[PDB]
Amino acid sequence: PPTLPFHGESAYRTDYVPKPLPEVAKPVEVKLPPTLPFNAQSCYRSEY
Amino acid sequence: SQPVFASPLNVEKRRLNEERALMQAQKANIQLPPNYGDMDLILFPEGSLKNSNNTVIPQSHLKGKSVALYFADGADPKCASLLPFLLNYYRTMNEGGANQKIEIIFVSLDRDREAFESHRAHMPWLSIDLENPLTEILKRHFRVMKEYEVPTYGYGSRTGVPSVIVIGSDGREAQFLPICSGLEEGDRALLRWDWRNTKFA
């Protein structure tokens, strides 16, 4: 008589394989608004 | 040195003035560098100003005029709203009299030549064409700009597009017409224009 060869693979042996790592490369590139150039052009030079 | 020390127009004015001053200094107890009151220049070269028939005029034609630069952009809804009132004001206050009172010189902030010509065809007074360095040097001289691409040297912007700015003989700022300014009156500030005390002398 033959031996029924043991096929069997547990939960811990089956149901996860090493996943590919998540592809993350994205910073928050913020274009700076340039400082709005200032003429609240003062009193002395403004009127006299 | 008015109104801006860091302007290409004024640095060229200074270089020319004290170059000449050094020339007669060595030719001749003289003051160096020359003071801005005795400093002199030509604001518009010979081939700059252009009237409605596309024939060139020089600077000396504007004697006895109240002259104002109109910095304008054709696609701007600001300028589209401002243009008919500028037309009306120029029209009526130059037709009603025995003496030709004001003159407006157009400085373009347009995308290209075709847009410049399309905007300038609706406009009867003088203009400076876009390929001239005079338009860009006047923009940096009077600090008119829509967005900071050109470097202003830690200094201000007097206005955004459009504006009418009356000018003097030596590039001085006579008065500011407050369209887009600290005062904020669109299409009404034109009544603040006084053509008496600001003559192109």
C-alpha span between B175 and A47 (Å, rounded): 9
C-alpha span between B4 and B175 (Å, rounded): 14
Q: State CA B89 to chain mean position distance.
A: 18
Strand partners for B144: B159
Q: Which pair of structure tokens corresponds to residue B140?
A: 């940096």
C-alpha span between B144 and B162 (Å, rounded): 8
C-alpha span between A26 and A11 (Å, rounded): 36
**Residue recorded with tokens 């003559």:** B199
For the beta carbon of residue B51, count every other beta carbon within 10 angstroms.
14
Q: B153: nearest CA in chain A?
A: A37
C-alpha span between B113 and A46 (Å, rounded): 36
- Is there a contact between B182 and A34 if contact means CB atoms under 8 Å apart? no
Burial B56-95 (b: 16+ CB within 10 A, else e): eeebeebeebbbbbbbbbbebebbeebbeebeebbeebbe
Residues B95, B101: contact at Cβ < 8 Å?
A: no
Q: What's the CA dihedral at B192, B195, B200, B201 to 10 degrees?
A: -120
Q: A33: nearest CA in chain B?
A: B148
DSSP A1-48: ----------HHHHS--PPPPP--------PPPPPPP-----HHHHH-
Q: Which pair of structure tokens corresponds to residue B11?
A: 């640095």
Who among B3, B148, B158 is closest to A34 (CB)?
Answer: B148
C-alpha span between B134 and B46 (Å, rounded): 12
Pairing relationship of beta strands B56-57 and B163-167 according to DSSP bridges: unpaired
Q: What is the largest CA-CA distance in chain A?
A: 118
Q: At what angle do helices B8-27 and B133-142 cross, to 10 degrees?
A: 100
**Residue recorded with tokens 């400076």:** B128
Site from A31, A38, A39, A46 to mutate, B interface, most B CB atoms within 10 angstroms: A39
Method: cryo-EM
Residue numbers in B near A36 (CB within 8 A): 148, 157
Q: Angle CA(B55)–CA(B79)–CA(B166) in degrees, nearest 5?
A: 65
DSSP chain B: --S-SS-HHHHHHHHHHHHHHHHHHHH----SSPPTTT----SS-TT-EE-TTS-EE-GGGGTT-EEEEEEE-TT-HHHHHHHHHHHHHHHHHHHSSSS--EEEEEEE--SSHHHHHHHHTT--SEEE-TTSHHHHHHHHHHTB-SSS-S---S----BPSSEEEEE-TTS-EEEE--SSSSS--TTTGGGG--SSS----
Residue numbers in B near A45 (CB within 8 A): 3
Q: Which pair of structure tokens corresponds to residue A9?
A: 């693979």
C-alpha span between B180 and B193 (Å, rounded): 15
Strand partners for B173: B167
All residues at 6 or more sequence positions from B169 whose CB lies less than 8 Å from its CB, including other chains: B43, B200, B201
Find the length of chain B: 201
C-alpha span between B146 and A2 (Å, rounded): 90
Residue type, B84: P
Strand partners for B107: B71, B128
φ/ψ of residue B49, rounded to 5:
-75, 145
Q: A38: nearest CA in chain B?
A: B156
Residue numbers in B near A42 (CB within 8 A): none
Resolution in angstroms for this experimental structure?
3.3
A34 touches chain B (CB under 8 A): yes
C-alpha span between B18 and B34 (Å, rounded): 6
Residue numbers in B near A35 (CB within 8 A): 148
Q: Sign (positive/negative) of CA torsion B134, B139, B141, B147?
A: negative
- Is there a contact between A36 and B157 if contact means CB atoms under 8 Å apart? yes
Q: Angle CA(B55)–CA(B60)–CA(B66) in degrees, nearest 5?
A: 95
Residues of B with CB under 8 A from a CB of A: 3, 143, 145, 147-148, 152, 155-158, 182
